Write a structure and sequence with these properties.
The complex is a heterodimer. Chain A is mostly helical. Chain A is built from one helix and no strands. Chain A is elongated, with a radius of gyration of 5 Å. Chain B is mainly alpha-helical. Chain B has one domain (1-227): Retinoid X Receptor (Orthogonal Bundle). In chain B, 71% of the residues lie in helices and 0% in strands. Chain B contains eleven helices and no strands. Chain B is globular and about 50 Å long. Classes of the chains: A mainly alpha, B mainly alpha. The A-B interface holds A 1-5, 7-8 and B 52-53, 56, 60, 70, 73-74, 77-78, 219-220, 223-224. The structure holds the ligand O=C(O)c1ccc2nc(-c3ccc(Cl)cc3)n([C@H](C(=O)NC3CCCCC3)C3CCCCC3)c2c1 (2 copies). Residues 40, 43-44, 47-48, 51, 85, 88-89, 92-93, 105, 108-109, 112, 114, 203, 206 of chain B line the site of one ligand OKH. One copy of the ligand O=C(O)c1ccc2nc(-c3ccc(Cl)cc3)n([C@H](C(=O)NC3CCCCC3)C3CCCCC3)c2c1 binds at residues 40, 43-44, 47-48, 51, 85, 88-89, 92-93, 105, 108-109, 112, 114, 203, 206 of chain B. Chain B: The modification Phosphothreonine is found at residue 198. Chain B: Chenodeoxycholate binds at residues 88, 118, 126, 203.
Chain lengths: 10, 227
């Protein structure tokens, strides 16, 4: 969700 | 005897793998924290949370991963989280520590709210991993392959199973250069990947245990482990 996509993108 | 597109690929995989540090602040707890199921569960959480932050960094520095689908990009990561952690745990666990530091570690692993019916297969896996005497390059490659696994709900598969391919081919060549005596090495390495996969069921079982018994996980871990 929120945290994973975040870590992936930035 | 590695090709140039093989040495560059290897060097790449090795560059990202060697970035995976673990803050001395978290690890120092193993030698300084109090011995209780809570403090040991606390260590596991902080460590496995840093591991996911670093695994994502290792995953995107992978050759071609970024040239994938944002749902396949996150499909893989969400899926490899458990396997990659236990693989890293097997690597660390199998390092030569000083006097009774390994006993200290094993004591913590035990008293961390996990029922032995999982602990037994865990150590069973660790020794088997320890027996293969794996090099740094083999752990890194194995980790890249476990991530680049076109299996278990990504849509594409063919593209996933196109980046993973030269990886395995490099893992093969490596098995001959360093362990030419044992030509079953490559088959045995892939063998531990099978035993690794079985950890998702056990991990689910342990999760619920900490869950029903009031042990809390970080929001990042809740996303990765599904809580
Ligand atoms: O960076 C990592 O990838 C890493 C990840 C997980 C670790 N778990 C322990 C550990 C396991 C059992 C005990 Cl008993 C204590 C720690 N260490 C050790 C460590 O960093 N100790 C510090 C060394 C620096 C001062 C603070 C402790 C190393 C250390 C080098 C050998 C391999 C394990 C870890 C290092
Ligand atoms: O530090 C070591 O040398 C080490 C070695 C083997 C390990 N096997 C487990 C384990 C047991 C159960 C589960 Cl479910 C998962 C792993 N852990 C845990 C951990 O945090 N691993 C890091 C995870 C991220 C990568 C680095 C190791 C906890 C276990 C409780 C006490 C503290 C260590 C281990 C830590």
């Amino acid at each position: 969700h929120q945290l994973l996509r975040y870590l992936l993108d930035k | 005897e590695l090709t140039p597109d093989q040495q560059t690929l290897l060097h790449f995989i090795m560059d990202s793998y060697n970035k995976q540090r673990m803050p001395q602040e978290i690890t120092n707890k193993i030698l300084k924290e109090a011995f209780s199921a809570e403090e040991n569960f606390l260590i596991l959480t902080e460590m496995a949370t840093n591991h996911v932050q670093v695994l994502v960094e290792f995953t995107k520095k992978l050759p071609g991963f970024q040239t994938l689908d944002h749902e396949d990009q996150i499909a893989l990561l969400k899926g490899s989280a458990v396997e990659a952690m236990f693989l890293r745990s097997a690597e660390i666990f199998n390092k030569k520590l000083p006097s009774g530091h390994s006993d200290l570690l094993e004591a913590r692993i035990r008293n961390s709210g996990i029922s032995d019916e999982y602990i037994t297969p865990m150590f069973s896996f660790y020794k088997s991993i320890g027996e293969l005497k794996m090099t740094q390059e083999e752990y890194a490659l194995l980790t890249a392959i476990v991530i680049l696994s076109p299996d278990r709900y990504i849509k594409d598969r063919e593209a996933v199973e196109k980046l993973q391919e030269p990886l395995l081919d490099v893992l093969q060549k490596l098995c001959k250069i360093h362990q030419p005596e044992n030509p079953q090495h490559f088959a045995c390495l892939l063998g531990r990947l099978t035993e690794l996969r079985t950890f998702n069921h056990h991990h689910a079982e342990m999760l619920m245990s900490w869950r029903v018994n009031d042990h809390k996980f970080t929001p990042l871990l809740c996303e990765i482990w599904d809580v």
